[PDB]
Ligand binder design. Structure first.
Ligand SMILES: [Mg+2]
Ligand SMILES: [Mg+2]
Ligand SMILES: [Mg+2]
Ligand SMILES: [Mg+2]
Ligand SMILES: [Mg+2]
Ligand SMILES: [Mg+2]
Ligand SMILES: [Mg+2]
Ligand SMILES: [Mg+2]
Ligand SMILES: [Mg+2]
Ligand SMILES: [Mg+2]
Ligand SMILES: [Mg+2]
Ligand SMILES: [Mg+2]
Lengths: 48, 121, 97, 216, 87, 206, 81, 129
RNA sequence: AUGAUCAGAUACCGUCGUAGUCUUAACCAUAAACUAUGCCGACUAGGGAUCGGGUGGUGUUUUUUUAAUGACCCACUCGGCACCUUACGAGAAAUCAAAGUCUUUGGGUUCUGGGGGGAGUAUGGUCGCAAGGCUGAAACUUAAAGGAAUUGACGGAAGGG
């Protein structure tokens, strides 16, 4: 049945699975942890 | 070694396809009629094509050789193939059956002279 | 890649098969993976057969046999020319020659 | 000249066969390119790319050239040929021969309302070669061919005016994507639709009407 | 297929398989079209008078061409007791 | 439909059950074979020879429909059918291929053995598989002298027969030739038999 | 085969199937009336019994249970009811 | 275990129509299966079918002509409003001129075009073309 | 601990040999724990073997020559461990009767992955007597790492000429 749940009341499982697997990305994880504001020399600005 | 090459073995079989009724089982007469009826640039090559063509003819006196197809040869083989057999092997003048053959022919709606024998396992 | 559909052994439905020792190097090998042969030999090896047959106290004597089942690892069986490497199409042949 | 050897070649040289719809109708296997450029004299070709393939040898690499060719006339017919050769011009010439040999028809249709001439395809249709899948979706008028450049020129040469396309897979493999698009437009005459539901009298083959215009 | 005022478009209305009602494509090189000769009152076949059967490459590769041709011939009356519905 | 002189005569039935054409295969049976009539306590099956007669007259109707008789092709790579297809090719316009079918004879239009037939008849589909396989490339119908265990893929008309026997293969080719000449009108006497003996189509040992 | 009558299978082919895989499922078992030596006392016994069925008049045990069909005792006369 | 008898029915019909067979046995034959088959039959996609009464659920033998490409189910039965019908038909029908989305509305089971005529919507069951 | 080999050899080889190997009562909770294929359900090709049960066959054989039995044979069926052939189909291919019924994409449900390193590392929990187990990053760094096949070259691999 292709992995994922398909039931009409199964939106919560799909939502939390998408959040958990969204953490596997590069740009999303960087934006949400805020490494540019913390661990970047320019601190997230374009110029310095 | 004296194994002949394509040129000798290929021209000779082509030559036999279109000149089989002229040429014979004698290398000498063979080496004369090729010399007019085909162009070979050297005498040594003419002597090997004629020599192998003489060899192939003797093979043709006894049965068919593979790799030749001229319409004459098979048709004469076709002609002497009846043998006119004395009586047809299928016909018994004086037939045998199992039980299943017997009810098969009774299903077909045919009456014919039959002798039933049991064919057991 | 997977080289053999049988994984180089014969085990479909156990999980574990208790091992044997190679007769040549004492390597532990599962009993299904081994190269089992059966060495049946007369004891007198057919060159001493006339000398012992005329040296016997008995006529008509049996000239008995030795029976042994040899268990080989893959390395020793390949090194001792018992089995050898075959072609990709010829690996699927299970018949003896 | 030509001096054909096929029953079909003798029929097309004699003038018994005046269209290639009869070939497509009776599924006659074409084996002579003179049939195709006789029955479709107006098709024009285009070579897609020339990429060099290499076979390793004792000293260095034997190299040859692979040329991909698309022929077609701009209403209904396309062919795709791919040939490897020692020389680039031989690869292009032989690819034009192979592309002419593989000419198939295309079923054009309407996105709606059947007013003008058929502008688009009749159904959604897919094709697959390698990893590549090309899907082709019927588009409204004035949409144009929405496709990458190679499969756009293939659909331009078919005679399609407007189609949406979707791809999947390693689409940068150009020969695979052209063969996938070729299968996708070949399937248009494969889909059975309610206008095709009605039964037909199964017409008899030109090879048996004209059976004595063969060799003997 | 036709436009808003008759004018049939979709040139090459194709053939359909006599067994599965499937379209025979232009490159289905396994498909055949059987012509069986008609007879009239004398035992002799009439030249050009056929009963015609198209069979697609799909049923031929599956091996089921012979049973399909049996059922089609028996339905058209040119066989008597070869095909059975109750299988 | 047919004028009911085409029914299985007792004379033809005598020929069929004399040649053991009814003696089919062993309990191997390709599931595409409903032609079998019962079974023998032996383990060998019996073929319904009435269906063999009906399939043979259907194949004769198919052969007679071809306009130019040279476009029929008869194949036998087995020795028991070579003389049979040569005699069938004598009595009918058909071209024979007896012995080796060289591949690429139906494809490969520059080959020296290039035929373009409108119908091909093979003796065994298993042994003559190269001919039926090429015929599936160029839209050619196939008629096969089938057995109860033969590989019937790409065969359109399967005439069930005992193709293990010498007399059966020759009798089937003989009856096929006789029926196509009767439908063509070379044999005007539908009821009277043929002056050619069925023993002419038989294999001889040397 | 691509054309067949699924509504009317032949009697042989339905007899070949498992009891649940036929068109409508039904038992292949049956009942017997068994008469015991001596007293007439006809009694009906299931074909696959699972019990040592005895006639009410005497301990004259009529069938023994097995893995399948019950084995009827040797002097007994049954009719398939 | 069996959750959707209608899905199993439609999968069996699809496998039969791929193989070229003219018939298929459906088990276990619910009401929605009958109504779905009646919708397919009125448009000419199947032909005659017969309901075998065993006493447990029924079986069905459908007769297949050559006209069906794919009958499918949509699981779950999504709630569908009236604009949703046009997005669903654009997603899963091959052209805008043939094929039907079947949906169970409160006025019975029907296809999408008759639902447009009655101006009614509901839940989506499957599709046929 | 020793005796050889070796440039070196506290490695491969040889002789001994502690812990261990065995068992009882407690812990540990990992393996290439592998079929590297989650479980439940339906459908789609043939075939021959075998294991367990059942049915049928006036079938062979044993025993009270006749009987059940038991063991075999033939046919069928249910459930299993597998195997052979096709390729309907699938796939990047090797290959696969499931890894099919997947752009014509929806039978139910659970778990995991998102370029290679850093790294199964730090850190914080939590279990454990310990050894460790389970959860588990980032800074930074890099344009490939990888899979399956092809043609060469080589092999202290096997054959042939
Ligand atoms: Mg729900
Ligand atoms: Mg990174
Ligand atoms: Mg390796
Ligand atoms: Mg293990
Ligand atoms: Mg994409
Ligand atoms: Mg040491
Ligand atoms: Mg794992
Ligand atoms: Mg499953
Ligand atoms: Mg059993
Ligand atoms: Mg079994
Ligand atoms: Mg098991
Ligand atoms: Mg690799």
């Amino acid at each position: 049945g292709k992995g994922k749940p398909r039931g009409l009341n199964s939106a919560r499982k799909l939502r939390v699975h998408r959040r958990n697997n969204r953490w596997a990305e590069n740009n999303y994880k960087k934006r949400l942890l805020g490494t540019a504001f913390k661990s970047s020399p320019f601190g997230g600005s374009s110029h310095a | 070694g004296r194994v002949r090459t394509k040129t000798v073995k290929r021209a000779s079989k082509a030559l036999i396809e279109r000149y089989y009724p002229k040429l014979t089982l004698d290398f000498q007469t063979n080496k004369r009629l090729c010399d007019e009826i085909a162009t070979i640039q050297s005498k040594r090559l003419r002597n090997k094509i004629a020599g192998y063509t003489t060899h192939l003819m003797k093979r043709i006196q006894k049965g068919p050789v593979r790799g030749i197809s001229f319409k004459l040869q098979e048709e004469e083989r076709e002609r002497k193939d009846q043998y006119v057999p004395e009586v047809s092997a299928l016909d018994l003048s004086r037939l045998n059956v199992d039980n299943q053959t017997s009810d098969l022919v009774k299903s077909l709606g045919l009456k014919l002279p039959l002798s039933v024998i049991n064919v057991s396992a | 890649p997977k080289k053999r559909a049988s994984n180089g052994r014969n085990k479909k439905g156990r999980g574990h098969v208790k091992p044997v020792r190679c007769v040549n190097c004492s390597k532990s090998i599962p009993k299904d993976k081994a190269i089992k042969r059966m060495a049946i030999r007369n004891i007198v090896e057919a060159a001493a057969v006339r000398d012992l047959s005329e040296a016997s106290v008995y006529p008509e004597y049996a000239l008995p046999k030795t029976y042994n089942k040899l268990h080989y690892c893959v390395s020793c069986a390949i090194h001792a020319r018992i089995v050898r490497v075959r072609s990709r199409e010829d690996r699927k042949n299970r018949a003896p020659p | 000249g030509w001096v054909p050897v096929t029953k079909l070649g003798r029929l097309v040289k004699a003038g018994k066969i005046t269209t290639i719809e009869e070939i497509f109708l009776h599924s006659l296997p074409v084996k002579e390119f003179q049939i195709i450029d006789t029955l479709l004299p107006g098709l024009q070709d285009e070579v897609m790319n020339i990429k060099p393939v290499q076979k390793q040898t004792r000293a260095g690499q034997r190299t040859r050239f692979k040329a991909v060719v698309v022929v077609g006339d701009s209403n209904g017919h396309v062919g795709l040929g791919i040939k490897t050769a020692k020389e680039v011009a031989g690869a292009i010439r032989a690819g034009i021969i192979i592309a002419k040999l593989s000419v198939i028809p295309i079923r054009r249709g309407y996105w709606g309302t059947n007013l003008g001439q058929p502008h688009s395809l009749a159904t959604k249709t897919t094709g697959k070669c390698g990893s590549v899948t090309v899907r082709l979706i019927p588009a409204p008028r004035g949409s144009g061919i929405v496709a990458s450049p190679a499969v756009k020129k293939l659909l331009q040469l078919a005679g399609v005016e407007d189609v949406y396309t979707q791809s999947n897979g390693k689409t940068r493999t150009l020969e695979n994507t052209l063969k996938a698009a070729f299968v996708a437009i070949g399937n248009t005459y494969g889909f059975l639709t309610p206008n095709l539901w009605a039964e037909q009298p199964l017409p008899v083959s030109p090879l048996d009407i004209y059976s004595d215009e063969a060799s003997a | 297929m036709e436009n808003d005022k008759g004018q049939l478009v979709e040139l090459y209305v194709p053939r359909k398989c006599s067994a599965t009602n499937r379209i025979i494509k232009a490159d289905d090189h396994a498909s055949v079209q059987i012509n069986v000769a008609k007879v009239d009152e004398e035992g002799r076949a009439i030249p050009g008078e056929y009963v015609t059967y198209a069979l697609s490459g799909y049923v031929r590769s599956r091996g089921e061409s012979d049973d399909s041709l049996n059922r089609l011939a028996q339905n058209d009356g040119l066989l008597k007791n070869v095909w059975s519905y109750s299988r | 439909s047919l004028p009911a002189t085409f029914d299985l005569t007792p004379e033809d039935a005598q020929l069929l059950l004399a040649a053991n054409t009814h003696l089919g295969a062993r309990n191997v049976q390709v599931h595409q074979e409903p032609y079998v009539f019962n079974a023998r306590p032996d383990g060998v099956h019996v073929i319904n020879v009435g269906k063999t007669w009906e399939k043979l007259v259907l194949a004769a109707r198919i052969i007679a429909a071809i306009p130019n008789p040279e476009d029929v092709v008869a194949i036998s790579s087995r020795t028991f059918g070579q003389r049979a297809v040569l005699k069938f090719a004598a009595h009918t316009g058909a071209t024979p291929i007896a012995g080796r079918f060289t591949p690429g004879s139906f494809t490969n239009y520059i080959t020296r053995s290039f035929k373009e037939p409108r119908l091909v008849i093979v003796t065994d589909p298993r042994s003559d598989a190269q001919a039926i396989k090429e015929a599936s490339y160029v839209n050619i119908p196939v008629i096969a002298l089938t057995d109860l265990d033969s590989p019937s893929e790409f065969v359109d008309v399967a005439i069930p027969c005992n193709n293990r026997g010498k007399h059966s293969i020759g009798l089937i080719w003989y009856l096929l030739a006789r029926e196509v000449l009767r439908l063509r009108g070379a044999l005007v006497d539908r009821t009277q038999p043929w002056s050619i003996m069925p023993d002419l189509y038989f294999y001889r040992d040397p | 085969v691509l054309v067949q009558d699924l509504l009317h299978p032949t009697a042989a082919s339905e007899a070949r199937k498992h009891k649940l895989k036929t068109l409508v499922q039904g038992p292949r078992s049956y009942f017997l009336d068994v008469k015991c030596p001596g007293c007439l006392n006809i009694t009906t016994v299931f074909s696959h019994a699972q019990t040592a069925v005895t006639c009410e008049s005497c301990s004259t045990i009529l069938c023994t249970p097995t893995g399948g069909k019950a084995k009827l005792s040797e002097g007994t006369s049954f009719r398939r009811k | 275990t069996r959750s959707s008898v209608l899905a199993d029915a439609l999968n069996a019909i699809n496998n039969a129509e791929k193989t070229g067979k003219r018939q298929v046995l459906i088990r276990p034959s619910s009401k929605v299966i009958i109504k779905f088959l009646q919708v397919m039959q009125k448009h000419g996609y199947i032909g005659e079918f017969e309901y075998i009464d065993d006493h447990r659920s029924g079986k069905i033998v459908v007769q297949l002509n050559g006209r069906l490409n794919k009958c499918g189910v949509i699981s779950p039965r999504f709630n569908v409003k009236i604009g949703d019908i046009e997005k669903w038909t654009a997603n899963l029908l091959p052209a805008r001129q043939f094929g039907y989305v079947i949906l169970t509305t409160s006025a019975g089971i029907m296809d999408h075009e008759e639902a447009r005529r009655k101006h009614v919507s509901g839940k989506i069951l499957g599709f046929v073309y």
